[PDB]
Amino acid sequence: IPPIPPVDFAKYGEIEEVPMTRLMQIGATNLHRSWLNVPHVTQFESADITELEAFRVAQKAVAKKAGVKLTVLPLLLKACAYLLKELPDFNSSLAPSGQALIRKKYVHIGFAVDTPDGLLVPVIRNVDQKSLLQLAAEAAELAEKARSKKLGADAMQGACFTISSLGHIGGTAFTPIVNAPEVAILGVSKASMQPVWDGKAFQPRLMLPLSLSYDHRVINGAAAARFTKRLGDLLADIRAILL
Amino acid sequence: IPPIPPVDFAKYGEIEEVPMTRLMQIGATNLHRSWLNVPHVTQFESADITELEAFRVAQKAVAKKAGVKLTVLPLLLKACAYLLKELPDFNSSLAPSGQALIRKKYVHIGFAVDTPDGLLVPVIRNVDQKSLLQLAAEAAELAEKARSKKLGADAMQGACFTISSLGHIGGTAFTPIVNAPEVAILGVSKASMQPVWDGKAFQPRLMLPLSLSYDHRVINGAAAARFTKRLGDLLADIRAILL
Amino acid sequence: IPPIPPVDFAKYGEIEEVPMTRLMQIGATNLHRSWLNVPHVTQFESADITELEAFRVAQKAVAKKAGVKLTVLPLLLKACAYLLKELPDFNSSLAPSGQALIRKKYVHIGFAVDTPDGLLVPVIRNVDQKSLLQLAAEAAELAEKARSKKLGADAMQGACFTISSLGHIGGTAFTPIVNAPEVAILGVSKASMQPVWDGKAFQPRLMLPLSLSYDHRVINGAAAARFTKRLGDLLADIRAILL
Numbered sequence: 001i002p003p004i005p006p007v008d009f010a011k012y013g014e015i016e017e018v019p020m021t022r023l024m025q026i027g028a029t030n031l032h033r034s035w036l037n038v039p040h041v042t043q044f045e046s047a048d049i050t051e052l053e054a055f056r057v058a059q060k061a062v063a064k065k066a067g068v069k070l071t072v073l074p075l076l077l078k079a080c081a082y083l084l085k086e087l088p089d090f091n092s093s094l095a096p097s098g099q100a101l102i103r104k105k106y107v108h109i110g111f112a113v114d115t116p117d118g119l120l121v122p123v124i125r126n127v128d129q130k131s132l133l134q135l136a137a138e139a140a141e142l143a144e145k146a147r148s149k150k151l152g153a154d155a156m157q158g159a160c161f162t163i164s165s166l167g168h169i170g171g172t173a174f175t176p177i178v179n180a181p182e183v184a185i186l187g188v189s190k191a192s193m194q195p196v197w198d199g200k201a202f203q204p205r206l207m208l209p210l211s212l213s214y215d216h217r218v219i220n221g222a223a224a225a226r227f228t229k230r231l232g233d234l235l236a237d238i239r240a241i242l243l
Numbered sequence: 244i245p246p247i248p249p250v251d252f253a254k255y256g257e258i259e260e261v262p263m264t265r266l267m268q269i270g271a272t273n274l275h276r277s278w279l280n281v282p283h284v285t286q287f288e289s290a291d292i293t294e295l296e297a298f299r300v301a302q303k304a305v306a307k308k309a310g311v312k313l314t315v316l317p318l319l320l321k322a323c324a325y326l327l328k329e330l331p332d333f334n335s336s337l338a339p340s341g342q343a344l345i346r347k348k349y350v351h352i353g354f355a356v357d358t359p360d361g362l363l364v365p366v367i368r369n370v371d372q373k374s375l376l377q378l379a380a381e382a383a384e385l386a387e388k389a390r391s392k393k394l395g396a397d398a399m400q401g402a403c404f405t406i407s408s409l410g411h412i413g414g415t416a417f418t419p420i421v422n423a424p425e426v427a428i429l430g431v432s433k434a435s436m437q438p439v440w441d442g443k444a445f446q447p448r449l450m451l452p453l454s455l456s457y458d459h460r461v462i463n464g465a466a467a468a469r470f471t472k473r474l475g476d477l478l479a480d481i482r483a484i485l486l
Numbered sequence: 487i488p489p490i491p492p493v494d495f496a497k498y499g500e501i502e503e504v505p506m507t508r509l510m511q512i513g514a515t516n517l518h519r520s521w522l523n524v525p526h527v528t529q530f531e532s533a534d535i536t537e538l539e540a541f542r543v544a545q546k547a548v549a550k551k552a553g554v555k556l557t558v559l560p561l562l563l564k565a566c567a568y569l570l571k572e573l574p575d576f577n578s579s580l581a582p583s584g585q586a587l588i589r590k591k592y593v594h595i596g597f598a599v600d601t602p603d604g605l606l607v608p609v610i611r612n613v614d615q616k617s618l619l620q621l622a623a624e625a626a627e628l629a630e631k632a633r634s635k636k637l638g639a640d641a642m643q644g645a646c647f648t649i650s651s652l653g654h655i656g657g658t659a660f661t662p663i664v665n666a667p668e669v670a671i672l673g674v675s676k677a678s679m680q681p682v683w684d685g686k687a688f689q690p691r692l693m694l695p696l697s698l699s700y701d702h703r704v705i706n707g708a709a710a711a712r713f714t715k716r717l718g719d720l721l722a723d724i725r726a727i728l729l
């Protein structure tokens with residue numbers, strides 16, 4: 001890999017050198033390792049979350065009683081956990097030989113937290129076994145631990161899949177990097193009101209932008225487009241998780 | 244290229260190792276070879292296909308008589324073949340020295356077929372010479388051969404360009420990988436009804452999402468944006484292929 | 487990096503070998519160097535530029551008197567220069583050790599010009615110090631020099647950030663390559679009239695598609711989504727640059 005030539009940046013004006021934290025350096029190295037090893041594709045999709053939002057908001061007091069805040073992340077975690085079991089190849093890693101897949105029979109999912117010192121991705125174990133309020137409690141606990149530098153490296157291991165949600169900040173879509181040896185990552189951006197054709201007129205529906213990057217060595221185009229379509233369906237009516 | 248560290252995945256739960264087919268392994272290797280050799284950009288565009296869809300549907304019985312099904316692929320194949328001749332740099336490969344281009348004077352186009360054993364990309368030769376019903380017949384024949392493992396490696400050689408259509412499954416857009424030594428690939432996702440401003444009001448138009456990835460060593464930004472704009476124009480009125 | 491196997495392209499029909507200019511070859515090499523060194527993410531956003539367009543058009547005669555044409559580029563240059571000072575990490579380069587950042591205290595911005603011989607990126611120095619008509623005059627001068635092969639390599643050095651605008655040609659969005667050692671590049675595509683929910687109904691607003699690619703070793707997801715959100719805000723009301 002050819003290196004970037006050094007440039008005397010001070011020839012063009014004043015510069016200031018500030019050091020990178022160790023977390024930023026670990027991160028830089030893992031990202032660059034994933035980038036070069038994984039042939040990335042991003043598949044974009046929009047999910048209609050009008051009803052899902054109404055549910056979330058109508059459970060505000062039950063969430064309050066439980067002392068948890070209920071955001072879209074536990075809902076995304078539950079729906080993805082259901083799909084990782086339905087489409088097992090997303091729940092796998094490429095074996096070090098490059099000639100077999102290791103299918104994981106558990107579902108643990110990490111979620112990205114951007115903290116001032118760098119990115120951490122805490123893992124929730126057995127997501128397919130926890131309820132929405134359990135996941136909400138857990139996600140908040142791990143996020144606060146991540147911010148407080150109090151998270152154990154123990155809790156950043158064993159993920160099958162990652163969710164990276166920027167919806168609280170903005171954006172229409174992005175192309176996340178797969179956290180190798182995982183095979184896929186779901187980016188979530190900001191939901192907005194969009195006109196959706198019902199067959200006769202455009203209705204306003206609250207649409208959530210989804211961006212799935214995947215390792216194309218393990219997942220082909222039709223599989224990935226089937227995963228985001230199924231995820232948009234489950235999010236459009238999450239009672240389907242019950243059958 | 245730093246390798247991904249091996250992880251004992253069984254520390255986190257139960258695992259199952261399943262082998263990769265040879266096709267999946269050939270594919271993994273070509274994809275990773277393209278990924279590292281081609282600096283990729285994807286240019287997105289939406290084509291108004293309202294009239295083109297009306298045409299397709301009104302020729303359903305002539306297609307039936309010919310025993311072919313007429314989908315959007317032959318139409319995409321014809322329009323791309325016309326543009327590969329109009330903008331010759333898309334119809335070329337970089338010479339092994341990296342200092343000349345080999346401009347191809349023929350137009351053969353491959354199209355991706357995802358089969359249970361892996362991805363195959365059959366090639367149709369001299370697309371610019373065949374009619375819409377010839378291409379429809381041919382594309383279906385090659386697709387069935389690809390599924391039946393009966394396709395000759397003969398028929399997976401010599402493409403100038405590739406079309407990867409996921410529209411039958413879903414999605415809004417994706418970022419396909421260039422099938423090197425080709426210089427560009429057209430991803431096609433699902434068409435949907437969108438409000439398009441006519442100058443005074445939004446009309447419902449059926450819009451087809453197009454995603455062109457190209458090798459930026461050979462094609463610059465303005466060339467690629469000109470190719471997708473011209474493709475959206477031809478698809479908005481394909482009678483322009485006649486002049 | 488595995489090489490692409492040579493193919494006898496003439497087995498499939500007639501070929502023509504044409505040479506690459508030196509500029510195309512320099513470019514191919516820098517692009518491929520950036521591609522392999524920078525783990526790229528693209529963050530997409532749409533900015534409401536209805537009022538900004540009305541301003542641009544209402545100043546047509548003052549621009550004329552100044553002999554400059556006022557396009558959206560000087561406006562983009564000023565708004566980005568304001569944000570590079572507000573969010574200093576975008577105005578930096580990774581030190582050759584990979585363990586510190588060099589924060590630049592100046593703001594020079596390059597912009598891509600696609601000329602028949604290849605891509606050039608002229609640099610405007612101290613963008614944060616020039617007015618909209620100064621930048622308009624300068625951008626046009628440098629663009630004409632770039633086309634006339636008369637631009638000095640002097641004038642292609644020292645950029646902190648690059649803007650690549652394809653809006654004059656077309657497209658909905660694209661994924662530009664970071665011009666390393668820079669850490670981010672803003673792609674701009676074609677503005678179009680879109681229905682935007684005001685809380686009660688969809689109004690037609692002129693929306694500008696923005697595509698920010700960044701080096702994820704230096705910039706994380708939340709920072710990049712905050713940069714495009716803030717840029718969409720400044721473009722929605724550029725009087726905010728005054729406070």
Ligand SMILES: O=S([O-])[O-]
Binds near residue numbers: 222355357407
């Ligand atoms: O398998 S994808 O390349 O359609």
Ligand SMILES: O=S([O-])[O-]
Binds near residue numbers: 463650
């Ligand atoms: O040639 S592109 O980088 O505008």
Ligand SMILES: O=S([O-])[O-]
Binds near residue numbers: 114119164706707708
């Ligand atoms: O820092 S990004 O991966 O959310």
